[PDB]
Structure formats: structure tokens, C-alpha cells
Amino acid sequence: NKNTPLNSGKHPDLKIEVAIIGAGTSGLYTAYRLVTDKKFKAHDVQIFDMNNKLGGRLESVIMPGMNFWGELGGMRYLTSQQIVTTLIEGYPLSEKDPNKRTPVLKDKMTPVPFPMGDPSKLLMYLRKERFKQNAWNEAQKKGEKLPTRYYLNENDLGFSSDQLFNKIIYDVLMADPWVAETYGSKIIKGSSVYDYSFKLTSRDWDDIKPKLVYNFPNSPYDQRKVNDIGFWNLIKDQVSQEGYEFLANAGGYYSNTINWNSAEAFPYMVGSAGTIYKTIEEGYDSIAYAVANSYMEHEGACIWSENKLLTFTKDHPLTNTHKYELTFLNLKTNTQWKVYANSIVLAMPRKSLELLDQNNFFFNINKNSVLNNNIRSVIMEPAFAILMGFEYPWWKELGIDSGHSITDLPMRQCYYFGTDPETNNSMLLGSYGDMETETFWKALSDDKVLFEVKAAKSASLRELHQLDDVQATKLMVGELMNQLRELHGDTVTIPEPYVTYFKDWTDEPFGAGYHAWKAGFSVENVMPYMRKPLTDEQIHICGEAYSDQQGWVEGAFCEAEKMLQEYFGLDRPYWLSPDYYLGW
Amino acid sequence: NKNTPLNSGKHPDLKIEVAIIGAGTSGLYTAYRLVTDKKFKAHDVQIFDMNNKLGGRLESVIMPGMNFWGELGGMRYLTSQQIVTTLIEGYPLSEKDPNKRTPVLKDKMTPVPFPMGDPSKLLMYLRKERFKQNAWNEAQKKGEKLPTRYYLNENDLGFSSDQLFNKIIYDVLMADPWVAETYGSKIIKGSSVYDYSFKLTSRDWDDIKPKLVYNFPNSPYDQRKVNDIGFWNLIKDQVSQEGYEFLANAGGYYSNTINWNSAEAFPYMVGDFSAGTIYKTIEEGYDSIAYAVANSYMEHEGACIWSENKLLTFTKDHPLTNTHKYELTFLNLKTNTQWKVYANSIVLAMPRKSLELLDQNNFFFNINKNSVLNNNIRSVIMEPAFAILMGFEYPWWKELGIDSGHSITDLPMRQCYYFGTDPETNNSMLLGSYGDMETETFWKALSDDKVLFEVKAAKSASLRELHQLDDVQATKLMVGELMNQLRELHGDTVTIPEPYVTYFKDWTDEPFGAGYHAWKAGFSVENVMPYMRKPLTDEQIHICGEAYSDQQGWVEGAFCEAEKMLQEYFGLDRPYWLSPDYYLGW
Ligand SMILES: Cc1cc2nc3c(=O)[nH]c(=O)nc-3n(C[C@H](O)[C@H](O)[C@H](O)COP(=O)(O)OP(=O)(O)OC[C@H]3O[C@@H](n4cnc5c(N)ncnc54)[C@H](O)[C@@H]3O)c2cc1C
Ligand SMILES: Cc1cc2nc3c(=O)[nH]c(=O)nc-3n(C[C@H](O)[C@H](O)[C@H](O)COP(=O)(O)OP(=O)(O)OC[C@H]3O[C@@H](n4cnc5c(N)ncnc54)[C@H](O)[C@@H]3O)c2cc1C
Ligand SMILES: N[C@@H](CCCC[NH3+])C(=O)O
């Protein structure tokens, strides 16, 4: 099922219609739709990737001793996300009997609820104070305002990150008279001082984001579109720099507090009625294999692996039959070869576009200044993944079965991932890094001395030594361990891990775990621009990077889907609800 | 003096010996040394720069209404920095009467002390608590430990940033039995629990840096070289993450607490010992020293700075291989035309970002061939810096008894310098400097906004005179928000009027990409610097400047790497005016 054939060879002067570069979710989706809907013969639609596997920022692994999937990248979806959810669970989404669902993909994918853990037992370690994540509510129940070691404005005393986030969004929304008048019924202040709520639809947000004005006559930002203010800028303005410190640390990875587009950050922070987080039992990269395999069933279909796009020109022998000559580097031989095509789908993030030849007709800055301006419209957020295997789930000593702990320590957030009921070998995702913490972790992960795998139950040295290459560094494992002991306190002994799995998503060609719209850009005009930057060229960009659901597979799918409907003459899939809002 | 001629023209197929690219301090210094010592005729040594001025990261400006120089880049030097000090002040450095000194450069430069201000009156604003910088020392004088809103380890309670830094570096140095035994006399615990001091020379540090071992039994970094540990990694290990938070915030810009090479951070933090040394500047603007070196170079006949001429690439494959090893292709920015220069030596007097912006596919940079060059180019952190000069109609900071110096905060602005009052006009200058600890991204969104602060007349400053600065004004959003932070910083007992003029430079802009550079942990710095001065054995191509110096942040770093390069590969002797006991390493 994950043995989808990959061709690391070359086919000099291959002639095709559509060259898809990026075997990520969006590249795979594009190929699947084109050939499934018979817009093109499989042999005329080809995917190229420089990697030695498909899926890009989806990579599921198994570590000896633990018979279940760890995620180095994407790990879960929301049933709000209708392209990825329908693909996994069949259609229609309304049918709630899973045996009256019609499958869309053949590949076996077993949906399973994402365990969220217990906030009575999940930790919050801020400025050396240890809390249960529930401590703000428990204090509110008892009429109290929880003291913390952040000096908030007095009006915000006792608030939780979530409630204070809600208050900031409510306050800013209601200060726009037009937003108050038109959507005030969807922007609700409850009875309790802490309770705010929203019923704003994706559609309502597309109306609000380009028009929202920041209405605060003493602020340096007064009478500016919220589109034009960084989220850090905006949060400090509303609740002081100590307010921003509290939210940026207490929010964890569920929160994006970088200084990105306030207008885009609003819906990102406050969310479709009755949705939940799920994953796939067979690994979250199963959705990529499933889309890939559906494409590769057609003979002529090919993923060219370990083949890196260098450049592309209109000035080549074959202009009578093919607009574009693409030059590929075949990595196994270090030889270049040519591919001829009439359409190019760059299914790749910002960093991957910047690593392509910047001097060709498409990227040359002396011609396409506007394209380069639009490529630079998104922040490249760093992420890494360190998976750690322990001989027993030491976290269960604190009544923690699953979920995440949050700290202002450089580790920021850990996920208690699961236990092998036969071995008791148990998995932590210790990581992701982010704001500032990239440089803290990068000095340690760049170090040359790798963690030494250690034998465990159902995990022999000769099984483990196959993972030598992908171990975290001793310095990074040592220091993460030191922080986990500090995070969890002295009432639990944490033993040394026996195996690790490390990936850094800042590495080329990814340059980022995820992307974030910059303040000052008309997101609603950039997105359609990137799906076809030049009027008289059949070159398209798709993927998560320039989507409005950054952070998610669903963003990559939606930009591919819109590109398909816009330029490749496809209708909405038969299996996708006509009410799922896509946009323009 | 600052009217040094620049040639924005071209001269196709110019045939020289040494092309120096970058008319910054190291490039100017290289050309000045080469001609003054008569190693080549001035027509055989040319300087090319893409800028419309010389000086690079030195740029001194005058704003209408204020008859004194503001600094967009470098401000100050230390009298222990012997090249930059001797070129400014003349020699010998022992002579304490300036009128008894012997000039080295003909251009006149008035050395003045850099006002450091009064720690009684300068502010520290941390987690919404307002301190005077001397509050820690005041508390200790009464036998007290000053509580703060940072939850230090108990053993560290009541330490100032300066004291806690010395304790950290003392503790780490002294835990190494070799360092203890060999340099314990120069690593000094005073009487008070807060008093740590260092007498380690430049030479002592060069012996210590590669050898020092982190000796803390249950540390994650135990038994590793301190050179292989990030400074944030080390600080946290030593005083907890709350301690790092205190030290990173309360440290000025003086302080470099990014996660760079710990071995290199130690000397940066506690000086190369000459305890009688002080900070000074040039009355005529700190860029004066670039102009003095550049003018000394230009008084030789055939000397030329090619301005607005950008190096694109260079090759060994050209028609003239019989006389000239290298063809350089420049872009003449005025005509948008490419012209060639032929040369046998290339001096890239430019930082990391500048190197990376050159053609990476040529024989020199090609990563498929020169993996070691590329690793080493990437051995320094590009640290962001912005400068915003703000001119007010009076020095509102005098209401708090502040004459000069720096106030420090955890607010995004991080630090402001009170730069001076024009005694005729009362027009008074403030610098906000910011960029470290993620404040880059806070400020970038505001400085990338396109509505600019509008100038406004004041005494001896007419809109006619101010409108020439329209293009260099800060954004309105940035000036508004910095003004809001200065009000929060100083408190509600002083009214801060809106300013009448600003001046913004972003040093992350190309081709600089950084204010200054920082060695990464885990590199053999003592081996990377010699490499960078001549990466390839078969090639007379050399890199000099501040970025790969061991005095990062400083003009003296640029001068020293050029000086070493001149002695190593251009057969120059030590300048007659430079003490032979000024340590330049190997
Ligand atoms: C740590 C982390 C956690 C995440 N968690 C989740 C989550 O829980 N849920 C979720 O839905 N999403 C999550 N995501 C995001 C999700 O993984 C991505 O949004 C999605 O996989 C991106 O797909 P894409 O189509 O944009 O392409 P990418 O995944 O970016 O793939 C692009 C491909 O292009 C290839 N390429 C680049 N340049 C070239 C070239 N010159 N020639 C050939 N090939 C080239 C690369 O090798 C790569 O395979 C997470 C991401 C990370 C990093
Ligand atoms: C905010 C700030 C504060 C500082 N404070 C001090 C201080 O107080 N005291 C002190 O001593 N030092 C200070 N410094 C450091 C000092 O300014 C620098 O270290 C010094 O100027 C570095 O000189 P350099 O030779 O490395 O070249 P740079 O000054 O980096 O100049 C390099 C030159 O190369 C040119 N160039 C690059 N690429 C090309 C190309 N392709 N073609 C043509 N030209 C090119 C650039 O235009 C530039 O003119 C400060 C720096 C900054 C940013
Ligand atoms: N979707 C990601 C989080 C997005 C991160 C954006 N900075 C996850 O669930 O892990």
C-alpha cells in the first residue's frame, strides 16, 4: 500500500501534456483528478519529485518495538475539511452510518478519533509555575481570578489564553461599525465576563477580512485595515506586551502568535457545528499513498522520484508541439535530462519555488517583479519533529493517557502519542520548535554526535541500527530530556529513550513546516494570482503555502481543486458536497 | 572630506592586478595598505561598490535642525582596538597628549569620548516593572537582594545582568581544571558574592577558546567543548530559562545572547583586558574613518572607487588568460549594461549575504565542487539590525535627569540611545536600534508598510530642508508604535512630543542582510578565518570584512581580517604605526 512504485530513472526527451513537480498532497491530488476525470491520458500526466518517497510534509514511520505509526509531519484532520475528510471516509458526509458511506479511494484507511487528553492532567509550565491546563476554569468556578507570573492589564486578570484570544477578536470585530451592524448576531458576548463565542462561516470571513478596519482612535494602527497589522502588533496593542507574552507561550502550537496577517489569524484562532480531530490508523501519509495509488493504477502513470527540476524555458527544439522544455537533475546519476510539456504545475512551497532557476522567463526579476513580490507574501514557519520511544509510558504516572503539555521552555509543546500494549514501548513527539526556539534547537540538531539506539523489548540492536541515520543528536536528546523532567516536575522519574526519529522541515526544499500570510497583502488576490501568475503561460502554483488553510493538507487540496476548476476544465468532484465553500 | 570622488561610469576591459569589491572599511583599508606600501601602482588596485556611497555599514547623517552627526551604522570604538584607534588618533597609543600624537591619515578627525550616561537616571523596563540600571547595586549596598519579575535560581537572586554574566563565564571557566590551573590568576572572585572580574588577554582567549571543556556532571552538554554549545543553550543550562529570559532582555545591544558560539561569546561579553580603555566616537561622524582611509587611497594617482557598479560573476574562462587569471562581470547600474574587468587577485570585502548574492554557479562558489567553501560561508549567523533616528524639538529625556546613554526594555524596541541636543535650536536626537530576540518580525510588518512619516518644520529646519529626507523617513505605523513604546518605557510623568524628522536604515536589506555576524557553535573558528582569507589553494581570491573576523560587530574586525590577508598573501609587513604587541594570531 506504501510501496507505490517510484521511478528514480530518467526518460530523455519524454513528451507529455502536464508536468507536475511536487509529489506532495497537492501534486498527487492534481494528477489523480486529471487522469480519473479523463482530461488527459495517464502517460501525458507525470509527477516529478526530488525526494526518495512521495507525500512531502506527510511522512509516517514505524520504530522497532512500537507496532503503530509515528508522524514526522502532518498527523490529523478536521471533519470540517471536506476534501481530505470525504477522500478518507467516503461520501456523502451527511450519511453518518459508515457502512452506507460510498468509498472514494480503494486503499484501506481506518479513521480513528484524535485522542485530545484530559485538561485536569495536561500540564502548563509558564515562567517556572506548573498548572493543570484546567486551572483557569477551576478558579473561575470558585469565583476567583487565577494569578499567573504574567502582568496582564487589570481588565484581563484571571482570563485564559482562549478566552483572552476570543475577547481580542470580539473587541476588534465589534469596533468596526459595518462588521457590528452586519454580523453582530454571529459575534456573541455571553453572560460570564470570560465567555465569548462566534458563528462566523468561511463565507462570512471572506466578506469581513478584506474590509475590516481597526477602530481604536488612540492606537498607532487606528483606521487601518486589520489585513495590514501584524498579529503580534495587534495583540500587544490590545492586551500589552505582557499580554502577548502570555498568549504566545500559553497558546502552544494550536496557537499561531507570529507577526502574520491579523485578518487571516482571526478565523485561524476561532474556527461547522460538531466537528472533531481524527487521524488514520495506518499512518496519516496513507491519504497520500491512496491518492498516489489511485493515479498509478492507470498504465502510463509515473512518479519520477529522485528527479529535481532545475529550470524550464520556451526556447527549445520542440516549440511546434510543446510550449515548455523542463531540465531535470537525475540524482542517482547526477545527469540532466529534458522533459517537454504544455502545462507546468509547481505543487511546492515558497522555498522550493525560490530554489528553482530564478533567471528563466518565469522568475527573472527584470520581467516578473510582481511574481517575486507574490512569492514573498508568506512567512516560512520553521518546524522539526523528534519522536522518542520509551520502554514505558512514564506520563501515565500523572494520569496522562494522551494530548499535549505546553511550556515557555524552548521545547514549547510535547504530545504523548501512544503505548504498544504488548511491549509497553511508548511514543512521545517532544517537539516542533518555532519563534526563536529554532536557533536554540538548530545548534544542538546540527551537532555531529548522534543519539545511540539502545535495545528494548521487541526492538533488537540490528532492527534499531537501520535507523542510525535518522537519530536526533545526543545534545538535542539530552537537552529535550532535561526540559521534559523540568516540565513534568520531580514527582515522576523519566528514563532515557531507547530510540529517536528526527526530521527538520527547514531543510531544502521545504524551508518550512508551514506558511503564514504577511500583513499588507490582499490574500484574496494573491491566491488566484499564484494558481496562474502569467496570463499567456500554462504554469500554475498550488499547495498549502499560498492556501487560506495554511497548516493543513486541506489547504493544499483546495488550491489544487480551484486550479483544476479554473484552468483544466474539471467540475467539482461528484463526491464533494456542492455547499463546501471553496471561494472565487 | 566626505566628498571623496565616486565613478558611477564604466571602463570596459579595464586591466588591473587587484579588484577589491566592497568600498566598506575592509575594502578601503586593503586598497589604502596596498598603494601606501607601494606594492602596486594605484591604477592596478581598484575598488568596486554597488552602493552610491562608500562606508558600507558606516553611514553618518546630518538632519536639518540638528548641527551634529547621527549614526545609521557604527557609532563607537574602543581604545583597545589598535588599528581603528591608531588610524583615528595617531601613535604611539602610550602617548596621552593628543597634540603629542603622530597622525597616520591626513584627514582631520576629533576623537571624543562616547557618553555612557548615568545608571542612576537610565531606565530598565522589564515585565512592566520600571528600574534604574543601578537598582541591583543600590539594593546590594543596603545588604538587600533586588526582587524582579523573573524567577531566577535561588543562588542567583539579586544579581544584575552584568554580575550574572560574569558568574556564568567565571563558573564555566573555573570548572575546567586546565583553565583554572593555567589562567586562575586572571579569573577573579572579588570579596562580595556579586563581584567577578577577568584579566584575560586576546592571546589568553585564543589559547582558551579551542580547548575549554564544559565540566558539569549531569548537564546535557557535559564533557563537550564550550565552542560546540550555543550561548543560549549554555546560559539556560547554567541559570535556567528564566535566567536566560532576564539576561537576554536586560542585556542591552552591548549584549549578544543569540544562540551563537559560546567559546566566542565569553570574550565578547567580558572584554579583552585593558581596564583603562573607553568607548570613543568621531565628532565629524564615525564614517569619517572610512573617508580618511578612502581619501588616503585616492591621493595616489590612478586610484578610483567605481560606485553603482555591482559584481555579478567572475570566470577563469575568458580571452585574456595569458595576462589575467580572472574576468569580472560588473553591472553598471546607471546604464543597466555589463562590462568586464581583468585582474589576477579578487578581494571580496563583503559580508555573508553579499557573497551569497554573487553568481553561485561560477568556479569559485559552485557547491558541487567547493562544499567546504559553502559550509564555511554558512558558519556565521546574519543578525538583523535596523536604525531609526528621531529628531524632537527638545530633549524630553532631560526631565528624568538623562543627559546621554541607553535605556533598555523587554518591549520590542529593546533599546534607545539619547544622542544629543543642538545647543542653538534645542533640536534633540534619539536612536531606537532593535532587531534581536524576534523583534525583527514585529518591526518588519510596520517598516514594510508604504505610508511614510511626514516631516514637519522646527527651529533652523524648514520643510524645504526636511523634504530632501522624505525618502529615508520611517513608516507612520512604526513611528506611531515606537512613540507608544517610548511613552510606556519612560512612564506617565514625562510628556513626549511627536518628532519632526526621522531617518530609517534596514541593514537586513541587500546586499548586507545583517547588522553584524555571529560564529555558530561547533565550528573551528581559528581554522575557518584563515580558510576564508584564501578559500582555494589554486586561486588568488580572498574574503575579508567583519563577517568572518573574531571581532564581529566591530570595524576593528574588518580591519584585522584585511590586515592578516595583506601580511599572508600580499607580502606587506606590519604597518610602522601599529604596535608589534597588538596580537593578530597566526
Ligand atoms: C510538523 C508538521 C505538522 C503538520 N501537521 C499537520 C496536521 O496535523 N494536519 C494537516 O492536515 N497538515 C499538517 N501539516 C501540513 C501538511 O503536511 C502540509 O500542508 C502538506 O503535506 C503540504 O502539501 P503540498 O501539496 O503543499 O506539498 P509539500 O508537502 O510541500 O511537497 C512538495 C514536494 O515538492 C518537492 N519538490 C520541491 N522542489 C522540487 C524540485 N525542484 N523538483 C522536484 N521536486 C521538488 C518536494 O520534494 C516535496 O515532495 C503539518 C506540517 C508539518 C511540517
Ligand atoms: C547598527 C550597527 C552598529 C554598529 N556599531 C558599531 C560600532 O559602534 N563600532 C564599530 O566599530 N562597528 C560597529 N558596527 C560594525 C561596522 O559597521 C562593520 O563591522 C564594518 O563597517 C564592516 O565593514 P566591512 O568591510 O565588513 O564591509 P561592509 O561595511 O559590510 O560593506 C561591504 C560593501 O560591499 C558592497 N557590496 C556587496 N556586494 C557587492 C557587489 N556584488 N558589488 C559591489 N559592491 C558590493 C556593499 O555595498 C558595501 O558597501 C556596527 C554595525 C551596524 C550595522
Ligand atoms: N495543522 C498543524 C498546526 C499548524 C501550525 C501552523 N503554525 C497541526 O495540527 O499539527
Coordinates of C-alpha atoms in Angstrom, one line a residue, chain A residues 85-410:
Chain A
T85 CA -12.4 14.0 5.1
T86 CA -14.5 12.8 2.1
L87 CA -11.3 11.2 0.5
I88 CA -10.7 9.3 3.7
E89 CA -14.2 8.3 4.9
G90 CA -16.3 8.1 1.6
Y91 CA -19.4 10.2 0.8
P92 CA -21.7 11.8 1.4
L93 CA -20.5 13.4 4.8
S94 CA -24.3 13.7 5.8
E95 CA -24.7 9.9 5.8
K96 CA -23.5 9.1 9.3
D97 CA -23.7 5.2 9.0
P98 CA -20.1 4.3 8.0
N99 CA -21.5 1.1 6.2
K100 CA -23.8 3.3 4.0
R101 CA -20.8 5.6 3.1
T102 CA -19.5 5.2 -0.5
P103 CA -15.7 4.9 -0.6
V104 CA -13.8 7.4 -2.9
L105 CA -10.4 5.7 -2.7
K106 CA -9.7 1.9 -2.7
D107 CA -6.7 2.0 -0.3
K108 CA -7.6 0.8 3.3
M109 CA -7.8 3.9 5.6
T110 CA -9.2 3.3 9.1
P111 CA -10.3 6.7 10.6
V112 CA -9.8 7.0 14.4
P113 CA -10.6 9.9 16.7
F114 CA -7.6 12.0 17.7
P115 CA -7.1 11.5 21.5
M116 CA -7.2 15.1 23.0
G117 CA -6.2 14.1 26.6
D118 CA -7.6 15.4 29.9
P119 CA -7.0 19.1 30.8
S120 CA -7.3 18.1 34.6
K121 CA -4.0 16.2 34.0
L122 CA -2.4 18.0 31.0
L123 CA 0.4 20.5 32.1
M124 CA 1.0 24.2 31.5
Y125 CA 4.6 25.2 32.7
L126 CA 4.9 29.1 32.4
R127 CA 7.8 31.1 34.0
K128 CA 8.5 28.1 36.3
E129 CA 4.9 28.0 37.5
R130 CA 3.3 24.5 36.9
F131 CA -0.5 24.3 36.2
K132 CA -3.1 21.9 35.0
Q133 CA -4.5 23.3 31.7
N134 CA -7.9 23.4 33.5
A135 CA -6.7 25.7 36.4
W136 CA -8.2 28.9 34.9
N137 CA -11.8 27.3 34.7
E138 CA -11.4 25.7 38.2
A139 CA -10.5 29.2 39.6
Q140 CA -13.4 30.8 37.6
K141 CA -15.9 28.1 39.0
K142 CA -14.8 29.2 42.6
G143 CA -15.4 32.9 41.8
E144 CA -11.6 33.6 41.7
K145 CA -9.3 35.1 39.1
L146 CA -6.2 32.8 38.6
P147 CA -2.9 34.6 39.4
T148 CA -0.1 33.9 36.9
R149 CA 3.5 35.3 36.6
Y150 CA 2.4 37.5 33.7
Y151 CA 1.5 41.1 34.5
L152 CA -1.7 41.4 32.3
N153 CA -3.7 44.6 32.1
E154 CA -6.2 44.6 35.1
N155 CA -9.3 44.1 32.7
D156 CA -7.7 40.7 31.6
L157 CA -6.8 39.4 35.1
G158 CA -7.9 35.7 35.5
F159 CA -8.6 35.2 31.7
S160 CA -7.3 32.0 29.9
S161 CA -5.4 32.2 26.6
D162 CA -8.5 31.0 24.8
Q163 CA -10.9 33.5 26.5
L164 CA -8.5 36.4 26.1
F165 CA -7.9 35.5 22.4
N166 CA -11.8 35.5 22.0
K167 CA -12.1 38.9 23.8
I168 CA -9.4 40.4 21.5
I169 CA -11.2 39.2 18.3
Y170 CA -14.7 40.2 19.6
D171 CA -13.5 43.7 20.7
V172 CA -11.7 44.3 17.3
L173 CA -14.7 42.9 15.2
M174 CA -17.4 45.0 17.1
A175 CA -15.3 48.3 16.8
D176 CA -15.9 48.1 13.0
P177 CA -19.5 49.6 12.9
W178 CA -20.1 47.8 9.5
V179 CA -19.0 44.4 11.0
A180 CA -21.1 45.2 14.1
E181 CA -24.2 46.1 12.1
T182 CA -24.0 43.2 9.5
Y183 CA -22.6 40.3 11.6
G184 CA -23.2 41.3 15.3
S185 CA -25.7 38.4 15.5
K186 CA -22.8 35.9 14.7
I187 CA -20.4 37.7 17.3
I188 CA -21.7 36.9 20.7
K189 CA -20.6 38.0 24.2
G190 CA -22.1 35.5 26.8
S191 CA -23.2 36.4 30.4
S192 CA -20.0 35.4 32.3
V193 CA -17.2 38.1 31.8
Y194 CA -14.9 35.4 30.2
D195 CA -17.4 33.9 27.7
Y196 CA -17.1 35.0 24.1
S197 CA -18.3 32.9 21.0
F198 CA -18.5 33.1 17.2
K199 CA -20.8 31.6 14.5
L200 CA -18.9 33.2 11.5
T201 CA -18.8 31.0 8.4
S202 CA -15.8 30.6 6.0
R203 CA -18.1 32.7 3.6
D204 CA -18.6 35.5 6.3
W205 CA -14.8 35.6 6.9
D206 CA -14.2 36.1 3.1
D207 CA -16.6 39.1 3.3
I208 CA -15.0 40.5 6.5
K209 CA -11.2 40.1 6.1
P210 CA -10.6 42.5 3.1
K211 CA -12.8 45.3 4.6
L212 CA -12.3 45.0 8.4
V213 CA -11.0 48.4 9.8
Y214 CA -9.1 48.6 13.2
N215 CA -11.2 51.2 15.1
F216 CA -9.1 52.4 18.1
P217 CA -8.5 56.2 17.9
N218 CA -5.5 56.3 20.4
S219 CA -3.7 53.2 18.7
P220 CA -0.8 53.8 16.2
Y221 CA -2.8 51.4 13.9
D222 CA -6.2 53.3 14.0
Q223 CA -8.2 53.4 10.7
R224 CA -6.0 50.8 9.1
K225 CA -7.4 47.5 7.6
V226 CA -6.7 44.7 10.1
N227 CA -5.3 42.9 6.9
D228 CA -2.3 45.5 7.3
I229 CA -1.4 44.9 11.0
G230 CA 0.8 42.0 12.3
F231 CA -0.9 39.7 14.8
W232 CA 1.9 40.4 17.4
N233 CA 1.5 44.1 16.7
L234 CA -2.3 43.7 17.2
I235 CA -2.2 41.5 20.3
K236 CA 0.3 43.8 22.1
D237 CA -1.9 46.8 21.2
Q238 CA -4.9 45.1 22.7
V239 CA -3.5 43.5 25.9
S240 CA 0.1 44.9 26.3
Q241 CA 3.4 43.1 25.6
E242 CA 2.9 41.0 28.7
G243 CA -0.5 40.1 27.3
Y244 CA 1.3 39.0 24.0
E245 CA 3.9 37.0 26.1
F246 CA 1.1 35.1 27.9
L247 CA -0.8 34.2 24.7
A248 CA 2.4 33.3 22.6
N249 CA 3.6 30.9 25.3
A250 CA 0.3 29.5 26.8
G251 CA -1.4 29.0 23.3
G252 CA 1.3 26.5 22.3
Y253 CA 1.2 25.0 18.7
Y254 CA -2.7 25.2 18.5
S255 CA -1.9 28.9 18.5
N256 CA 0.0 30.9 15.8
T257 CA 1.1 34.1 17.5
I258 CA 3.9 35.1 14.9
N259 CA 3.6 38.5 13.5
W260 CA 1.5 37.4 10.5
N261 CA -1.7 38.8 8.8
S262 CA -4.2 39.7 11.6
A263 CA -7.2 39.4 9.2
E264 CA -6.1 35.8 8.4
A265 CA -5.2 35.0 12.1
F266 CA -8.7 35.9 13.3
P267 CA -10.6 32.9 11.7
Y268 CA -7.4 30.7 12.3
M269 CA -8.0 31.2 16.1
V270 CA -11.8 30.8 16.4
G271 CA -12.8 28.1 13.7
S272 CA -19.1 24.0 11.1
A273 CA -21.1 22.7 14.2
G274 CA -19.9 19.4 15.8
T275 CA -16.5 18.6 14.1
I276 CA -13.5 16.8 15.7
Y277 CA -9.9 15.8 15.1
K278 CA -9.2 12.4 13.5
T279 CA -6.2 10.5 12.1
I280 CA -5.7 7.3 10.0
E281 CA -4.7 4.1 11.9
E282 CA -2.3 3.1 9.0
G283 CA -0.4 6.5 9.3
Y284 CA -1.5 10.0 8.1
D285 CA 0.7 9.7 5.0
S286 CA -1.8 6.9 3.9
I287 CA -4.0 9.7 2.4
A288 CA -1.0 10.5 0.0
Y289 CA -0.4 6.8 -0.9
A290 CA -4.2 6.4 -1.5
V291 CA -4.3 9.5 -3.9
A292 CA -1.0 8.4 -5.4
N293 CA -2.1 4.7 -6.0
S294 CA -5.4 5.8 -7.5
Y295 CA -3.3 7.7 -10.1
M296 CA -0.7 4.9 -10.5
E297 CA -3.4 2.2 -11.3
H298 CA -3.6 3.8 -14.9
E299 CA -0.8 2.3 -17.0
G300 CA 1.4 5.1 -18.3
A301 CA 1.1 6.8 -14.9
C302 CA 4.5 7.5 -13.3
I303 CA 6.0 9.3 -10.2
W304 CA 9.6 10.2 -11.2
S305 CA 11.5 10.1 -7.8
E306 CA 15.0 11.4 -7.0
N307 CA 14.5 13.8 -10.0
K308 CA 14.9 17.5 -9.2
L309 CA 13.5 20.3 -11.6
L310 CA 16.4 22.7 -12.2
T311 CA 14.9 25.2 -14.8
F312 CA 12.4 25.4 -17.7
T313 CA 12.4 27.5 -21.0
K314 CA 10.2 28.3 -24.0
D315 CA 13.4 28.4 -26.2
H316 CA 13.9 24.7 -27.2
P317 CA 13.7 22.5 -30.3
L318 CA 10.1 21.4 -30.0
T319 CA 8.0 24.6 -29.7
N320 CA 5.6 23.4 -32.6
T321 CA 4.3 20.6 -30.2
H322 CA 5.3 21.7 -26.6
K323 CA 5.4 25.2 -25.1
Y324 CA 8.0 24.2 -22.4
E325 CA 11.2 22.3 -22.1
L326 CA 11.9 21.3 -18.4
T327 CA 15.5 20.3 -17.4
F328 CA 15.6 17.6 -14.6
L329 CA 18.6 16.6 -12.5
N330 CA 18.5 12.7 -12.1
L331 CA 20.1 12.4 -8.6
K332 CA 21.2 8.7 -8.7
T333 CA 23.4 9.6 -11.8
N334 CA 23.9 13.4 -11.4
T335 CA 22.9 13.7 -15.2
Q336 CA 20.5 16.3 -16.6
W337 CA 17.6 15.2 -18.9
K338 CA 14.9 17.2 -20.8
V339 CA 11.0 16.8 -20.5
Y340 CA 8.6 18.6 -23.0
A341 CA 5.1 19.7 -21.7
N342 CA 2.3 22.2 -22.4
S343 CA 1.4 22.8 -18.7
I344 CA 3.5 23.0 -15.6
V345 CA 2.1 22.5 -12.1
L346 CA 4.6 23.7 -9.4
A347 CA 3.0 21.8 -6.4
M348 CA 5.6 23.1 -4.0
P349 CA 6.0 25.7 -1.2
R350 CA 7.8 29.1 -1.3
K351 CA 11.3 27.7 -0.6
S352 CA 11.0 25.2 -3.5
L353 CA 10.0 28.0 -6.0
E354 CA 13.0 30.1 -4.8
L355 CA 15.4 27.2 -5.3
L356 CA 14.3 26.9 -9.0
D357 CA 16.4 28.8 -11.6
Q358 CA 15.5 32.4 -10.9
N359 CA 16.9 33.7 -14.3
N360 CA 14.4 31.9 -16.6
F361 CA 11.5 33.6 -18.4
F362 CA 9.0 32.9 -15.5
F363 CA 11.1 34.0 -12.4
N364 CA 13.6 36.6 -14.0
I365 CA 13.1 39.7 -11.6
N366 CA 13.8 42.1 -14.6
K367 CA 10.5 40.9 -16.2
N368 CA 8.3 39.3 -13.4
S369 CA 8.9 41.6 -10.3
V370 CA 5.1 41.1 -9.4
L371 CA 5.5 37.2 -9.3
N372 CA 8.6 37.6 -6.9
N373 CA 6.6 40.1 -4.8
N374 CA 3.8 37.5 -4.5
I375 CA 6.1 34.5 -3.8
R376 CA 7.4 36.5 -0.8
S377 CA 3.8 37.2 0.5
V378 CA 4.1 34.2 3.1
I379 CA 6.3 33.7 6.2
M380 CA 8.2 30.3 6.1
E381 CA 7.5 29.0 9.7
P382 CA 10.2 26.5 10.9
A383 CA 9.2 23.1 12.3
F384 CA 11.1 19.9 13.2
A385 CA 9.9 16.5 14.6
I386 CA 11.6 14.5 17.3
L387 CA 9.8 11.2 18.0
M388 CA 11.1 9.4 21.2
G389 CA 10.4 5.8 22.2
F390 CA 10.4 4.9 26.0
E391 CA 10.3 1.4 27.4
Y392 CA 7.1 2.5 29.4
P393 CA 4.6 5.4 29.3
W394 CA 6.1 7.4 32.3
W395 CA 3.5 10.1 31.6
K396 CA 0.7 7.7 32.8
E397 CA 2.2 8.1 36.4
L398 CA 0.5 11.6 36.1
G399 CA -2.9 10.2 34.8
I400 CA -2.0 11.4 31.3
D401 CA -3.1 8.9 28.5
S402 CA -2.9 11.3 25.5
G403 CA -2.9 15.0 24.5
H404 CA -0.3 17.8 24.7
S405 CA 1.6 19.7 27.5
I406 CA 2.6 23.4 26.9
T407 CA 5.6 25.3 28.3
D408 CA 7.6 28.6 27.7
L409 CA 10.6 26.3 27.7
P410 CA 12.3 26.0 24.3

